[PDB]
Amino acid sequence: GKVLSKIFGN
Numbered sequence: 558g559k560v561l562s563k564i565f566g567n
């Protein structure tokens with residue numbers, strides 16, 4: 558959701 562961009566690593 559909004560974490561949705563870290564657990565995306567890179």
Ligand SMILES: *C(=O)CCCCCCCCCCCCC
Nearest residue numbers: 558559560561562563564565566
């Ligand atoms: C929001 O919509 C995504 C939330 C990010 C953390 C939990 C979702 C996990 C599903 C995405 C797979 C990413 C690698 C586990």
